[PDB]
Amino acid sequence: TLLKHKKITIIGAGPVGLTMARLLQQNGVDITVYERDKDQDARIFGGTLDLHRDSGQEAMKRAGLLQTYYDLALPMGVNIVDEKGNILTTKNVRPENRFDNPEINRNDLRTILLNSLQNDTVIWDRKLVTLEPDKEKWILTFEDKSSETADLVIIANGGMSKVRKFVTDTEVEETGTFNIQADIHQPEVNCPGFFQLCNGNRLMAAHQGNLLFANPNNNGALHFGISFKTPDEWKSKTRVDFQDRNSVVDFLLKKFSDWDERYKELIRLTSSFVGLATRIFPLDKSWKSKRPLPITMIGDAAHLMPPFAGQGVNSGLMDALILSDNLTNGKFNSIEEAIENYEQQMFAYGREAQAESIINETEMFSLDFSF
Numbered sequence: 001t002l003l004k005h006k007k008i009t010i011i012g013a014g015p016v017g018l019t020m021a022r023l024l025q026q027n028g029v030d031i032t033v034y035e036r037d038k039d040q041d042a043r044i045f046g047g048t049l050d051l052h053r054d055s056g057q058e059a060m061k062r063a064g065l066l067q068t069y070y071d072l073a074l075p076m077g078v079n080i081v082d083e084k085g086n087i088l089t090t091k092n093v094r095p096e097n098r099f100d101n102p103e104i105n106r107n108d109l110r111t112i113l114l115n116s117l118q119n120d121t122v123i124w125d126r127k128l129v130t131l132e133p134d135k136e137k138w139i140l141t142f143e144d145k146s147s148e149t150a151d152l153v154i155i156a157n158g159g160m161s162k163v164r165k166f167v168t169d170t171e172v173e174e175t176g177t178f179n180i181q182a183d184i185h186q187p188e189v190n191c192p193g194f195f196q197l198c199n200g201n202r203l204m205a206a207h208q209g210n211l212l213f214a215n216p217n218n219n220g221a222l223h224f225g226i227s228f229k230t231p232d233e234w235k236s237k238t239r240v241d242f243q244d245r246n247s248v249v250d251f252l253l254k255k256f257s258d259w260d261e262r263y264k265e266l267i268r269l270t271s272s273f274v275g276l277a278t279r280i281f282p283l284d285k286s287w288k289s290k291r292p293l294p295i296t297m298i299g300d301a302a303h304l305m306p307p308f309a310g311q312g313v314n315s316g317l318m319d320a321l322i323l324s325d326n327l328t329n330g331k332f333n334s335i336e337e338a339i340e341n342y343e344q345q346m347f348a349y350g351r352e353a354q355a356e357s358i359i360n361e362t363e364m365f366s367l368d369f370s371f
């Protein structure tokens, strides 16, 4: 009854926003999702996601999508490999644990979520630019100069959201590490040396402060990421131009001088690199207790943190579960109280996850680290 005759708008059709949409809409709420991506066919760059039983999988179950997730997810082994290609540990998958946290492609996840929504729930090509309250409703203005209205706004548009003002003025901060990601499509053909070294398992390696993570089978592509402490020179002078492949390759081949040729080949064979400083949206300061209209935040928009904890999507999916529950479970007598309780709970597990992620980051990039 809280949401009677209420138009709810979710900003962002990432995993968290689509899951929030589903959890509300299945209860007959009036939901719209605004997504900047041009259309549903847009390729989502990055690695695979794994849903944990007590958070992400619980959200999928509550949404009716757990078996669909299992159908499309792949259980993956993991090898810890030294810089010379020697496997130090092979942690293959046990049929016992195949459903513990199988890896799902990000586009596959978006599709099962989209398929669970009514048609035309997501409005594509809508990059929200301004969000200001008018009367008792929010005014949403998009890059394409269109405008829309809503009674409640849930911000789920990622860690770099520019529309957080009415919730908090806290700013994103860099943590001191940097990540470079890329894909090699059809790796069996195009990087056979490294693909064979992976041996059908995810690969992790750490050397001289440089971490390499790779997944040889993300829907026909090998995805890899190289992470390190941000060079201090970058702080003032830019040394690597991430629009110039050859600039990136020259830097990485320098860093990877001591590594086996199969790793150097992987770098030489990548057509395009994506470089990003690790960031956090810290939960140190409380959010604003006075807001002009109902608004809150979920996912990375709420608690962006370094991904080396394996945290990330599962916290966001718990946000959607708790916020959706609060809004539909009859326990609260206003939207504001339902939101405030959600934020209370999220700050709790969010602060915990952020603290673990910073510890792990400090440990993983120390020169003594060994997995």
Ligand SMILES: Cc1cc2nc3c(=O)[nH]c(=O)nc-3n(C[C@H](O)[C@H](O)[C@H](O)COP(=O)(O)OP(=O)(O)OC[C@H]3O[C@@H](n4cnc5c(N)ncnc54)[C@H](O)[C@@H]3O)c2cc1C
Pocket (backbone or CB within 6 Å): 011, 012, 013, 014, 015, 016, 017, 034, 035, 036, 037, 047, 048, 049, 050, 126, 127, 128, 129, 156, 157, 158, 159, 161, 179, 181, 225, 298, 299, 300, 301, 307, 310, 311, 312, 313, 314, 316
């Ligand atoms: C290098 C790296 C590796 C990671 N690895 C993992 C991992 O292994 N496991 C894990 O669980 N997590 C991982 N994470 C984190 C995980 O990807 C995020 O937690 C997760 O994607 C957050 O989902 P979200 O829906 O909050 O935001 P996002 O996935 O960022 O989705 C936000 C959506 O909003 C859209 N959007 C943005 N701005 C606007 C706008 N103005 N208007 C409209 N729409 C907009 C975006 O296009 C996008 O669709 C990793 C993160 C990084 C950076």
